[PDB]
Structure 1
Amino acid sequence: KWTYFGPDGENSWSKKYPSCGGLLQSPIDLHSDILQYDASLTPLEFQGYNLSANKQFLLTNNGHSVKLNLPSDMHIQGLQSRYSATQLHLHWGNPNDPHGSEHTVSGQHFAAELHIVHYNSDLYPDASTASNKSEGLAVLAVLIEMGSFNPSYDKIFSHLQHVKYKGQEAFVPGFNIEELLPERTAEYYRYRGSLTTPPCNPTVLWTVFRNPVQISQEQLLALETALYCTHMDDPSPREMINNFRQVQKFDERLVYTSFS
């Protein structure tokens, strides 16, 4: 149906998913010429992010990414509407070219990128209904670079063995999702954009934190090598690598920054 490689790749998404060729597409290059300081961009509060260690949360390989389901009582405070969590997932490159972030900064890819997807729960009953509606979604984006081992990211990565193939599922004990966020979360880029995957609805309020997090070389290699896009019994297995969209044109538009 859709892929990041070959005939069903990103240049063909618009055939079945017309919004992928429409307005307000993400991701984009965040570069000095288009940044504008906005003193109105106050710090977000992360509420209910400390997930009950007594709850288990579904981890899925959906053939596009690895996705952790999140509970709706987890939310962002600070925007006009409350935005409630639905899921998080990641984007990455491959061991030969370990630069698979979606957003770039001054033309540079980061190793990987985490998305924590939220929906406008003040206006909409669920993320599906919100996804194609005004003010529907808000995503927190964390840029990931290689560095020190990260025990918080290992709370997800330690389970990748159990979701190797498309359709496979595992359970993750609740942990503090705020541990996945970088230093100085008050420092971020903000713009109106889209889902970076089909159906590419232009309904996302993007918050890209200024500061990256670090995971070890072994953690990054595990993420790049652990998963397949294909079902376990597929006779032509496809490694899940390079699951990021190319940057989109962004002309006559600003990205607002919470930092000078």
Structure 2
Amino acid sequence: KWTYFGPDGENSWSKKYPSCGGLLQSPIDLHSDILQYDASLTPLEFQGYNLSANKQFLLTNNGHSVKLNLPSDMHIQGLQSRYSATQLHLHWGNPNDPHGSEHTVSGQHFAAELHIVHYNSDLYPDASTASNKSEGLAVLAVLIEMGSFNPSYDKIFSHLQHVKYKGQEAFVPGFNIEELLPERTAEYYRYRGSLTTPPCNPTVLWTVFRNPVQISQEQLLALETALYCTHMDDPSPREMINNFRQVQKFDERLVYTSFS
């Protein structure tokens, strides 16, 4: 139905998912010509992010990324509405071009990107209901680069060998999800955009933190090499690589920054 490579790739999403050719598409290149400092932008607070290690959270290969289900007890404070968490997931490149972030900064890719997806729990009863509705979603984006071994990201990566193929599932003990966030979360880019996957609904308030996190080259290579887009009974297996969208046109619109 949709992929990031070949005839069902991103240039063809709009055939069956019209909003992929519509307004407010993400991701974008964050560059001086479209940035404006906004002193009204306050620091986000993260509530309920300390998940119990005695509780289990579902990790799934859905054929396009690895996703961790998150409880609606997790909230963002500091937006117009309360947003409650629904799931997180990643995007990455491939071992021969390990530059697979969705957002770029001054034209530069990072190695990977984390998305923590939330829904407007003040207006809507669940993420599905919010997904295609006004003010429906808020996503936190974390840029990832190569550096030191990251024990917090390994709380996810250590389970990759159990979700190699589409539909496979594994359980991840709770941990504090703030451990996936960078330093100085108070510095971020803010803009109105979309899901970066089908159905590409233009319903996302994006927060891209300025500062990346670091994972080891070994961790990045495990992520890049562990997973497949296909079912375990598929005679045509496809490696799950390059699962990021290209940057979108961003014309006569602004990205707001919390830093000058």
**Normalised-by-shorter TM-score class:** over 0.9
Q: Separation in 2 of the partners of 1:146 and 1:177?
A: 20
Q: Which residue of 2 aligns with 1:245?
A: 245
- Tell me the alpha carbon deviations over residues 105-130 of structure 1, each in whole angstroms, 9 at most, x when there is no partner: 00000000000000000000111110
SS in 2 for 1:108: coil
Query: How far 1:54 sits from its partner (Å)?
Result: 1.4
- Tell me the alpha carbon deviations over residues 209-232 of structure 1, each in whole angstroms, 9 at most, x when there is no partner: 000000000000000000000011
Query: How far 1:84 sits from its partner (Å)?
Result: 0.2
Give the TM-score normalised by structure 1. 1.00
Query: How far 1:233 sits from its partner (Å)?
Result: 1.5
Q: Separation in 2 of the partners of 1:231 and 1:17?
A: 23
Query: How far 1:235 sits from its partner (Å)?
Result: 1.0
Query: How far 1:53 sits from its partner (Å)?
Result: 1.2
Instruction: Tell me whether 183-192 or 48-57 shows the greater mean CA deviation.
Output: 48-57
- Tell me the alpha carbon deviations over residues 140-166 of structure 1, each in whole angstroms, 9 at most, x when there is no partner: 000000000000000000000000000
Q: Separation in 2 of the partners of 1:254 and 1:227?
A: 36
- Tell me the alpha carbon deviations over residues 47-97 of structure 1, each in whole angstroms, 9 at most, x when there is no partner: 000001111000000000000000001010111100000000000000000
Q: Separation in 1 of the partners of 2:163 and 2:209?
A: 28
Q: Which residue of 1 aligns with 2:52?
A: 52
Q: Which residue of 1 aligns with 2:17?
A: 17
Give the TM-score normalised by structure 2. 1.00
SS in 2 for 1:222: helix
SS in 1 for 2:115: strand
SS in 1 for 2:152: helix
Q: Which residue of 1 aligns with 2:150?
A: 150
Runs of 4+ in 1 over 4 A off after TM superposition: none
Identity %: 100
Q: Separation in 1 of the partners of 2:83 and 2:36?
A: 24
Q: Separation in 2 of the partners of 1:79 and 1:167?
A: 34
- CA-atom RMSD, angstroms? 0.4
Q: Separation in 2 of the partners of 1:49 and 1:242?
A: 29
Q: Separation in 1 of the partners of 2:146 and 2:75?
A: 28
Q: Separation in 2 of the partners of 1:166 and 1:135?
A: 31
Unaligned runs of 5+ in 2: none
SS in 2 for 1:195: coil
Q: Separation in 1 of the partners of 2:12 and 2:212?
A: 31
Q: Which residue of 2 aligns with 1:98?
A: 98
Query: How far 1:236 sits from its partner (Å)?
Result: 1.0
Q: Separation in 1 of the partners of 2:125 and 2:9?
A: 32
